[PDB]
A and B are shown apart, each in its own frame.
Chain A
């Protein structure tokens, strides 16, 4: 609800000069709150808030920064997490909960999902308040599985997605259309499908090369 109402004037603010002014933060930070709350996203706004915090360290808001970082982790494998690394010094990175979120983010970025599930503060209020974080992290893990496995084990899929019982496992497996397979696997993609080399199957050079060589 709130996001679109702000967006109609925020998209002007981001293409004005207004994005370099700290006075605009109180609407932009609320736009970040609304991105966590209503699950929306704006990269030019978040990058502007991070640049304002970077230039002006005294306006560094930890809860707003943490919401940008947690939304950057919902967007993997996009470069939002890299942009967050660029704009924040170690002193502002190392505080609570920022250092925990960065460690959890490197565990996601380096594909250590099992370590991420085992290292997550269960009773942190801030994690609950990021609308749709849980489905989005599992969608990233399923995306890595769907690109890079032809068949996967049933225990291995549960292990990667965070201890999903076979009722919950169906709500993930059937969400991507994945089939049951024999003794006792899950079918993800065909072997013929996941090859298709673009290289070598070429040498269409001659019509282009003969044209530029004609005279």
Chain B
């Protein structure tokens, strides 16, 4: 959660930075150091996450979320069975 807040704090700095970088070009002339350089950084982000785009891949992602949820659900069941064994042997 601390890492997610650091990442959202950073992402909000990126929104503010790119807004300033564009507006510098609109106002008079700007963005020369931020041209194909930043366009490669933003692409470097996008190529990694979200990887690709089609329906096949998001369907695969949602199936994996259901399996990760199933493993998490089974881990609640194992912990509850350990609790059922715990509750029988501490009376």
Chain A residues within CB distance 8 Å of chain B = 203, 206, 209, 213
Chain B residues within CB distance 8 Å of chain A = 62, 65-66, 69, 72
Residues of chain B within 8 A (CB-CB) of A213 are 72
Contact B69–A203 (Cβ < 8 Å)? no
Residues of chain B within 8 A (CB-CB) of A206 are 65
CA A213 to CA B79, docked complex, whole Å = 14
Residues of chain A within 8 A (CB-CB) of B72 are 213
CA A27 to CA B72, docked complex, whole Å = 67
Q: Which 5 A-B pairs have the closest CB atoms?
A: A203-B62, A206-B65, A209-B69, A213-B72, A203-B66
Residues of chain A within 8 A (CB-CB) of B62 are 203
Give 5 pairs: A residue, B residue, CB < 8 Å, sorted on A.
A203-B62, A203-B66, A206-B65, A209-B69, A213-B72
CA A213 to CA B69, docked complex, whole Å = 11
Q: B56 to chain A: closest CB distance in Å?
A: 17
Q: A127 to chain B: closest CB distance in Å?
A: 60
Residue of chain B at shortest CB distance from A205: B69
Q: A31 to chain B: closest CB distance in Å?
A: 59
Residue of chain B at shortest CB distance from A203: B62
Residues of chain A within 8 A (CB-CB) of B66 are 203
Residues of chain A within 8 A (CB-CB) of B65 are 206
Q: A68 to chain B: closest CB distance in Å?
A: 54
Residues of chain A within 8 A (CB-CB) of B69 are 209
Residue of chain B at shortest CB distance from A206: B65
Q: A90 to chain B: closest CB distance in Å?
A: 55
CA A44 to CA B45, docked complex, whole Å = 68
Q: A200 to chain B: closest CB distance in Å?
A: 13
Q: A210 to chain B: closest CB distance in Å?
A: 9
Residue of chain A at shortest CB distance from B62: A203
CA A213 to CA B66, docked complex, whole Å = 15
Q: B59 to chain A: closest CB distance in Å?
A: 11
CA A109 to CA B6, docked complex, whole Å = 66
Residue of chain B at shortest CB distance from A209: B69
Q: B40 to chain A: closest CB distance in Å?
A: 34
Q: B75 to chain A: closest CB distance in Å?
A: 11
